[PDB]
Symmetry: D2
Subunit: 453 residues, 4 copies
């Protein structure tokens, strides 16, 4: 045995699965706002001999020898991360070891808070992320709500915007040690200056979790959270278009000096993680260099234009939008004026090769049948979609919604609806016709990555 045989020769079962996934990505319309298509160059670094190296510790301060090259790679990744976000290295440092976005946030909390210290994030049904402290009325769900004490803040349900007035009021009472400014399903720009005002008043750290928007920030097409935040976390995928990994940025130097750096680095290792994934660090460095280019700014400008074109086309077809529009990469569609809930809509769309996700709307009464859908522009913009192409996407979505409305008129519960899509031959024929047109359209656009896997 050599371990030099190709995947296609040595594991045909897995090779066929990879090819099937690649074909699915190429023939569908990917509208999941957290999805993107990573470059071949980054993937070549991800599947490299860097996987083999144990390098616990930090550059120049490792537990094991033989780290001279991985030290250069980790330091290069740090420099490229600061450059991508236009950060003065005298004022900011970065930890490039977090395994993903969720590990990055957990490390921040572990670094800066004692167990049971208080955090506030946007509530999950209102557009926040699990790792911002989510628990339900009946059990603690995120580990952030088990090891720490969380209390959510809310949207103003009338406007769909974060209710900064109520956040200021409740933060004075709850006294959080850390407030998280960052979202998973929010179409507007966060008022980071207002968030900093609240944090300064109550003496909380401001963490900006920019995972969804990090590429837009790097491209300077929206305002930067780094102007106001103490700590910034992000994934390296999503709008940054890298391999899956995480980053923690922190202020350093004179504020009396900042005291984040040593605590953040210690929390990542030795407290929480083990050996870094050097292949991921290298792939991230490749993507961060791409994020510095004029090409990436044009891409990010096009993401904003495409989201806006999608929002406009939906308003023209009788849909509503939570918060009335978008200033970023995604759109929050309110399907309630159409009479079809988001659980039914997402499934019809899935069966015609359009991937979107159901989304809770302000005023919804049931989590099983939420009122809306979340639609994103990053992934298809990476396939060279322009505004006219996103208008064609909306035309396909509206066709799918119309099929759903007819199935709704012939079915009762969500389970009946779902089985009908598969069991009713007439419905099945209509979905197949729409799927063929969607896939013929989608296949005509280029795709980042390898050719077949």
């Amino acid at each position: 045995w050599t371990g030099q045989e190709s995947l296609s020769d040595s594991d045909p079962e897995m090779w066929e699965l990879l090819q099937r996934e690649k074909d699915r990505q190429c023939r569908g319309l990917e509208l999941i706002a957290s999805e993107n298509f990573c470059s071949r160059a980054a993937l070549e670094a991800l599947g490299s001999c860097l996987n083999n190296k144990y390098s616990e510790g930090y550059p120049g301060k490792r537990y094991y020898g033989g780290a001279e090259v991985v030290d250069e790679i980790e330091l290069l990744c740090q420099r490229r991360a600061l450059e991508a976000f236009d950060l003065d290295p005298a004022q900011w440092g970065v930890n490039v070891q977090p395994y993903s976005g969720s590990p990055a946030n957990l490390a921040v909390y572990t670094a800066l808070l004692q167990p049971h210290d208080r955090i506030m994030g946007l509530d999950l049904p209102d557009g926040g992320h699990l790792t911002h402290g989510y628990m339900s009325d009946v059990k603690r769900i995120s580990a952030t709500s088990i090891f720490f004490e969380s209390m959510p803040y809310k949207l103003n349900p009338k406007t769909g915007l974060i209710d900064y007035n109520q956040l200021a009021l409740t933060a004075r009472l709850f006294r959080p040690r850390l407030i998280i400014a960052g979202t998973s399903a929010y179409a507007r720009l966060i008022d980071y200056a207002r968030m900093r005002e609240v944090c300064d008043e109550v003496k909380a750290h401001l963490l900006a979790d920019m995972a969804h928007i990090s590429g837009l920030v790097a491209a300077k097409v929206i305002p930067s959270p780094f102007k106001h935040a103490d700590i910034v976390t992000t994934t390296t995928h999503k709008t940054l278009r890298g391999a899956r990994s995480g980053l923690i940025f922190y202020r350093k130097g004179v504020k009396i000096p900042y005291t984040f750096e040593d605590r953040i680095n210690f929390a990542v290792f030795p407290s929480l993680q083990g050996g870094p994934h050097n292949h991921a660090i290298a792939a991230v460095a490749v993507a961060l260099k791409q994020a510095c280019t004029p090409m990436f700014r044009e891409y990010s400008l096009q993401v904003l234009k495409n989201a806006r074109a999608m929002a406009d086309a939906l308003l023209e077809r009788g849909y509503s939008l939570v918060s009335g529009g978008t200033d970023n990469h995604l759109v929050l569609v309110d399907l309630r004026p159409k009479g079809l809930d988001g659980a039914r809509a997402e499934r019809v769309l899935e069966l015609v090769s359009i991937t979107a996700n159901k989304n809770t709307c302000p005023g919804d009464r049931s989590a099983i049948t939420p009122g809306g859908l979340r639609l994103g522009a990053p992934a298809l913009t990476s396939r060279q979609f322009r505004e006219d192409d996103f208008r064609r996407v909306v035309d396909f979505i509206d066709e799918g919604v119309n099929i759903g409305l007819e199935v709704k008129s012939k079915t009762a519960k969500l389970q009946d609806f779902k089985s009908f899509l598969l069991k009713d031959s007439e419905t099945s024929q209509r979905l197949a016709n729409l799927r063929q047109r969607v896939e013929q359209f989608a296949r005509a656009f280029p795709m980042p990555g390898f050719d077949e896997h």
Copy 2:
């Protein structure tokens, strides 16, 4: 821009760095017991379009659609994991989403314990892992010691073996909810039956963290912790020779066990976000390899090579902690030789031999380790046999002798290290040894791609 450009064209700076790391791996004698060389097939899956799919949740119970293929891949990985360890799915389930070994352990604790509940693991200087609950006299180090309350168990310093008698005595007083059986620097086999006896008496869960030994267990060349443990965690790299990732195995069915739902919920939604599907696929590739006669032969050769290394060190007057080995590694006590592990590790590094300094029972300075930890897995993957490991030991002995000379000429550890670099006679001696080491190592095959 297409995103289809080759790394070598689009990022020459990074491409040169990758090639330099590959050259370092090919020219060195890798004796770090936790290191291995992953196959090209697994690396091809690791750097694939699977990176591009968000699949929070579990097969058939995802948050998002479009998961039909990733569902098949995750289910296949689960099946191959159970097959590699000879497990009946009626008795065992597996979660293939943990991002690494340390995330796997944290998910077990979060699943089964409340904050501040008690755990016992082998102390770090005695051969346990950070994630088994390590804190020092000075501060809480592992997050396992922050979110939970840990108390270590110890080696018997006279034998170098886990002191099962004292573990039982102290577990009765401390009342842990979970005891960890698993090591990072131990050359003998754990008495899992005795660990089960202690856990049954005090009503604690038994977690076996088999990360260091997982390939040996899969190959059935040493006894299996699955005979006795409630939960088993492991890395997918190290002796399993896969991409970096983790696994959690758990008992299910009649005992009924109530681990499955808690374990899966702790991984997601409690701790992690989207799975790394490219890692899951790469792991599945390596697990299929681990089921083969090839892999049993590999693991048998790992044991033979560790024994050959131990025997060669004994013949040259080295002492071994616990007197020898029953697994993939050797624990050398350099104290009787007159050189400590910090000094030896650095000399060896400078001649392209990577090993680990290692705390020994007879150490008198809690700061400077007395020994070295030497492993056979990585070089065995390069087709090294017993005679080749005897040659490795001769190179080590040359390096140790250089270290002894430098020690006689220098005071502090930092003075020793600087002397290796700046004393011209010493650097010439190191250069000569490095060249013989590297020309020996380069002639063996290497798993993976040709140049990166």
Copy 3:
């Protein structure tokens, strides 16, 4: 060797003979109590009968455990006393023993609350109480912007609720809003500086919505509740704590009442009893239990209802007299035993006022008012009726008390016009001859007035 050098110790000697130093101190404290105008709303004067039980051989009995379930034998009489105290507590509050139980062992009010939290909550579980500056108690979970003050905020996670600053009333709307976000496991309805009646029905509505326990901490008002002169928290709360002193006029101790029987049964009783002992306390103080039983029997009488009605009338008369003299009241008046004065329009803060009053033998407390800009200089004064009502003060006597207070406020205003910082004000009261003479004159008049009224307890100690 004669006299005391020829007399063996018996432990039966009188305090006045065996410890003259302590006897003189006790008499000095009694004289201070008799000659002052006690306006601290949490103060009262305990009966001689209860004090005779408090200083008794019951001090000598260890009785860890509960009646019929003790660790040690010889408890037959202390069992009867503890059971009698329980029965009298339920009787005083008109409670059916099939629906309510009571634990009579808590050492004081603060131990009672801690036992409830320990019984019903896990460490770090969430509690909400009225904020301290807004009229809550420390034991309802107080921490400052700077550190954790009450042990309730250390072992549990507290978040306050607030007054409506414009009305001076508890903001029930905001409590409901924030309880939905914070998700408390227990909400406390009870105050230390609040002049109005708590809407216990609304508190129970909030608790039912968010699935929290409602604890009523009625320490300040317990006598008024027993006398049925204000509405009872027992109509809406499932746990009630109280001190046995204050308006109940007993020895210092605590009580925990809890629902029991059919709710499917309630599950409070065993947890509450176990938290008191063995979890938190050691041997009960049987002398205090007996003294409490004496006071609880007093609280069941027509005499005590007339006392409690007079407390209400006297607080109202004090409030009216203050309004007639130009003072402002937080919430505009009182429905209970105390009055919250807002001195800000008069131009004198509560720290200055409280110190002037103390120097003329009137004890009151400075009190934070809504809108205050400094805790060192709170805007108000809290004035209570229970203690002087126990000395047979009636409405006209409280009007005379207000006349004295007004003279003290006027002295404070004059000193304020002559001094800068609070420390300068305080020093001026002692060192300026003209001011000290004016204080001495007012003090003489206060003390002759106060000494004329009767006093519960022993004659001289």
Copy 4:
């Protein structure tokens, strides 16, 4: 109504109960080692107008005015506490507000430890106290084990002595922040110097909880824990013969100063307690002044002589003693060689007006029928008992044990044994005859306190 009426006139029901308890105390033989009889002078202070005064805070630092006299009383109590224990006020302070012994310990833990910090105390069945951190295999029992993390240390079962070697071994592993030296059922002197050695090695605070022995310490008839512990708690009752209350002593001054004083005072108030019980503080001060006298030293010497006389009389009759003897105020009798367990024995004794308590012995298999009895000398020594009188006490105990052995031979379960004592005419007559002789003997001795209540 004046509130000046006597208890006998105003509450005849309660008055009769007080008289019945007084008669029970006078006619019985009190052998509970934690019991004593408080002086009339202290009781007169306890039942005084000091009950009426709210004085939250500390002398000169109160929340409310009018505290000039209670300030003098509290300071006098502090001075008398330091005098009773031979302490230099420049080196030691004391907090006199704890409501009882258990509140004193909880305040120390709250002052010096964070929630979930580690404590070690002697296991409850081995002679420790609940408040030193007791939990069973199935439930956390003491609040000390809920809010803090406790692990017990043990006796050497062969010798009946604290196993200092095993304490040192396990303290190195468990890393307690505080170790408690103090017992509720131990007949030997604690090696405080060894305890301090262990604490110094592992960097733990040493707390001496001297509640059982405090009067012996004050009288200087046994060695003082203040030579080796820098924090000491105690009850003010038991061997100190005061009203029920607690004390916390702590080192202060140059140690770089000690930092105990402010943390301990803050923990007592405002953290844990409310208004002090000034009547108890005054009663404690009265008892502490008594504890400074030659009278009290002679009393305490007699306590030791009486416990030794009791032990020797039991040994002469063939009883075994746990640890083989006594060095303090109590005796641990092992009844197993006689064939009668402590639950059976304690109940027979109770029915003849002798109060003792069953006590777990090393090797016992059941807590329902422990092997021994704990017998104390303080209470009867306060009634002028001397050595010959304790020999008479042992004569009565032995008669009771013999009755218990006869009943045991005629009955099966513990419930049958207990029923037989009440329902068998011959047994009830034997008990009545012994009870009459015990009570005739006991009534002849004097009694501290009031005449009838």
